[PDB]
């Protein structure tokens, strides 16, 4: 492929194991804060929101007192894996993502997706791009 479009497209938006269902959202950053490739549904993220996740990889923890924001919307923290994958929750939705060499791999969810669905759909892709070497 020679657009990371085509990843969020065919990796992070398709039917999920053809249930009919699909992430609400999704993106690739890299681990500057730079946009790859984002769904046109993915919110307006703001700068710092995006900072704070890249510390997050960096030191597992410090999201803890304020939540994960993105796009003004909060999200607790829920078990992740520290310096691969931080996971959050909002209602019956939430976030996960999963931290590559050079990347980081957004998925956003909504019911009646369930968390694991998420996780699945962007380890899979993260662990793509980390075969790859990146
Ligand atoms: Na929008």
């Given at each position: 492929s020679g657009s990371w479009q085509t990843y969020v497209d065919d990796?992070?938006?398709?039917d999920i194991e053809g249930t009919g269902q699909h992430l609400t959202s999704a993106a690739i950053f890299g681990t500057?804060?730079?946009?790859?490739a984002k769904s046109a549904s993915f919110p307006e993220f703001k700068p710092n929101e995006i900072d704070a996740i890249i510390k997050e990889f960096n030191?597992?923890?410090?999201?803890?007192?304020?939540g994960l924001f993105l796009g003004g919307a909060k999200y607790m923290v829920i078990q992740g894996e520290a310096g691969a994958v931080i996971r959050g929750k909002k209602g019956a939705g939430g976030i996960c993502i999963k931290k590559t060499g050079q990347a980081m791999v957004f998925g956003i969810y909504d019911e009646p997706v369930a968390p694991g669905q998420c996780n699945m759909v962007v380890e899979r892709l993260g662990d793509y791009l980390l075969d790859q070497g990146m």
């Open positions: 990796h992070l938006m398709c500057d804060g730079t946009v790859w030191e597992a923890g410090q999201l803890a007192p304020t």
